[PDB]
Amino acid sequence: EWVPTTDLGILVKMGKINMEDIFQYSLKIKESGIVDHLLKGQLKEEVIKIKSVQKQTRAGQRTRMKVVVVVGNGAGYVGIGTKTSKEAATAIKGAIERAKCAIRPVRLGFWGNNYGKEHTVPCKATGKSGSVIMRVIPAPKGSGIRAGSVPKKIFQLAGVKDVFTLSKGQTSTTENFAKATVSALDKSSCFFVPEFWREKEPELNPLSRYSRLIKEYREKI
Amino acid sequence: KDLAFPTAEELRTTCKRKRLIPQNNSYFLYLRCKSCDIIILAYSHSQTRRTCPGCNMVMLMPKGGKARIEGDVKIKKIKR
Amino acid sequence: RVRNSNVKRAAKNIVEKYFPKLDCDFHHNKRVLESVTEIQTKRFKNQIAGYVTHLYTRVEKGKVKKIFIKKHEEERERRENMIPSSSIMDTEKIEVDDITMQMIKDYCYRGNY
């Protein structure tokens, strides 16, 4: 069992907030056990790259393994995190909880028309990490994920099914090539389209809406 | 702050060409010599000496911008 | 010699928890320390009880900004309650400089340069 020290996980353990309305009001997920509680069924961890970094000290090269991992549900949510540690299995479970803290929603869209369920990225966007430019392009249905091996693993966990991609720069740098491809999905999802031109009246955010309700849960313990 | 309606405070600060409508800082005027009954007329940013013809004194001398007026002269702007 | 954090953080806790039972003389200050703690080796008692006296000398002057003692804020709040010579009564026909009065021309009183 996990004890939700964070205030948002208090409302998550109480089931006050769904997954989709965390990112509605832009509340930072401090603790990783929030989203594994919400996505207890579907959450797949997939290791992108294990590589070993070194610093030369006085005696010998201090070598440590640096892993970069991607987590995601079946469709809609994806995150990436990286941790470097002395032994790789310590680094992976540290990277996974960092990825779970950094899950972002990916809005999917329709390529041409609104029939069926959504399958592709909604707009054309570009994620740019250091010197790696990944550009996602909406693809018609059945086209599949047209990408390299590392973005396709992110694209599978993000739940897109048809995408055309373009890359520039040093895509062998796979931490940058993974950080760019989620940044495109980050940017294509919050592209401001005429479907969302409709102004909604703003709503009170749930952590200050349930601001009375959280303090008794600490007073219970 | 509205760009289509610039306040009268900001218009005199900004450049004459950079206003919403290009507005002159110059004008014309009348110079009144005391020994002399006529009123010689001249430009504000004048580039020529102006002297009252009879009872000959020098009214304004040209300068870098506005012409500086010499001696005892009453000036009146001319706008209408 | 220089004490370490195993001694200093210890001796900080002794003077903080048990201040009134202490005194400036070291041998009495050690005699409380066997009575009130459990420290195994007799040299390391003298390491701690020595620095307790080096603390209790400067906490008698009240110099340390960290530790906090129940007697030392109730004496402080007597010092805090100054018999107030607030200048709101001491200033009569307030001299405000030439441009400072002009900003208060809507609702004004006590006009002086």
């Binding site: 964070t6 205030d7 | - | 805090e80 107030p84 400089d97």
Partner: protein
């Protein structure tokens, strides 16, 4: 309508030298300036603009359900009792001295509560808190001087913080409007005895 300043309250801020603003003003501050003293080269702050930013700050303060969630901070020792007399009165959590960085982000430390608002005495003196608040989606009211920076500050209260009485007057008046917003106490406060607790006397 607009709430009018008491002659009692405006009596305080002139001898607080809160309108004695600073020698320099930024273009973000010029709307808070009626004029500047041509003698001392000191910008004199608008009191009417100062008072209405106080009531917006009071409006923003009470809007949270619990005032104890609000973590008010002051780096300097001038406002040590100005925040101590504040939090006994308003029922908020005080932060005095050096704000330990990571105080809102690092979850290994649980000294205070997760903030839903912070208000600081000075963005120059508490640049660490106003940055750390922006990492956790937390609003920031600030008392801000004429020379001071105002980035990552939601509500600027244009007032001086370089006098010992000045933040003592400002934290007093911000406590005065708060219970006036709740209707807990009107302006019938008799400042003869109250504001001196906020004052820094030593």
């Amino acid at each position: 309508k607009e709430i009018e300043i008491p002659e009692d309250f405006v009596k305080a801020i002139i001898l607080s030298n809160a309108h004695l603003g600073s020698t320099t003003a930024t273009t973000n501050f010029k709307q808070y300036i009626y004029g500047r003293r041509k003698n001392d080269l000191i910008h004199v702050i608008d009191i009417n603009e100062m008072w209405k930013k106080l009531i917006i700050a009071a409006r923003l303060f009470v809007s949270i359900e619990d005032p104890s969630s609000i973590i008010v901070a002051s780096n300097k020792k001038f406002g040590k009792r100005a925040v101590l007399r504040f939090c006994s009165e308003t029922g908020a959590t005080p932060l005095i001295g050096r704000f330990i960085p990571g105080g809102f982000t690092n979850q290994v430390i649980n000294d205070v509560k997760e903030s839903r608002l912070v208000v600081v005495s000075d963005t120059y003196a508490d640049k660490q808190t106003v940055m750390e608040a922006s990492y956790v989606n937390t609003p920031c009211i600030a008392f801000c001087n004429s020379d001071n920076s105002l980035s990552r500050v939601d509500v600027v209260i244009p007032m001086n913080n370089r006098s010992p009485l000045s933040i003592g007057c400002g934290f007093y008046l911000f406590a005065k409007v708060i219970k006036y917003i709740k209707g807990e106490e009107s302006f019938d406060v008799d400042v003869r005895s109250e504001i001196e607790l906020y004052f820094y006397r030593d």
